[PDB]
Structure 1
Amino acid sequence: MGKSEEELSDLFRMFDKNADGYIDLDELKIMLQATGETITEDDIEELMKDGDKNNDGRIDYDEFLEFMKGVE
């Protein structure tokens, strides 16, 4: 996990490559590419499951908090 919502905020606002307020599946798979992201298509949805348990296709800061517990 990060430190608190001070650093967590930038991980959400500065990571949205689409620029709309909510991170989507396309930006998540393109964000971890700098630190790894070398897996199959199911692994892309692995993090999306905890970030978006509804699977609607959009991640908000409220759901971002719930994901930090699964991604650690």
Structure 2
Amino acid sequence: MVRCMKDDSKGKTEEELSDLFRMFDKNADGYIDLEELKIMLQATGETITEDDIEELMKDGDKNNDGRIDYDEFLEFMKGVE
């Protein structure tokens, strides 16, 4: 039958991935760049270099536009290896 609260629909769809994108973003505009990503990366303990970040954007970018967005993230996260 039909429920009220409906706590069965617990499927990890793209709806949940949309949040992961905002985490990486700095100002939450919808796109990510080496400069922006370099900021969030600074929080990490290890000392990453500007060159090391280029690798993250290289494989992270699928539209060869230079930045990463929801469409790119959903594609990058949906099977990185």
- Which of the two has higher C-alpha Rg? 2
Structure 2: where are the runs of 5+ without partners? 1-10
Q: What is the alpha-carbon distance in structure 2 between the residues aligned to residue 22 and residue 70 of structure 1? A: 20
1:41 aligns with 2:50: yes
When you count helix as a share of all residues, which structure comes out higher?
1
Q: Residues of 2 paired with 1:65 and 1:26: CA distance?
A: 21
> What are the residue-to-residue correspondences of 1:13-28 with 2, within 5 Å?
13-28=22-37
- 1:13-68 deviation per Cα after TM superposition (whole angstroms, max 9, x unaligned): 24321432111111111112222452332211010001114543321111113333
TM-score when scaled to structure 1? 0.64
In the superposition, the TM-score normalised over structure 2's length comes to 0.59
Greater mean deviation of Cα atoms: 46-55 or 23-32: 46-55
Question: What RMSD over aligned residues (CA atoms) do the two structures have, in Å?
Answer: 3.1
The answer to which structure, 1 or 2, has the higher relative contact order (CA under 8 A, 6+ apart) is: 1
**Which ranges of structure 1 fall in alignment gaps of 5 or more residues?**
none
* Structure 1: 4+ residue segments shifted above 3 A: 2-7, 69-72
Q: Larger strand proportion, structure 1 or 2?
A: 2
Distance, in Å, in 2 between the alignment partners of 1:29 and 1:70 is: 23
Aligned length: 71
Contact 2:42/2:48 (<8 A) preserved: no
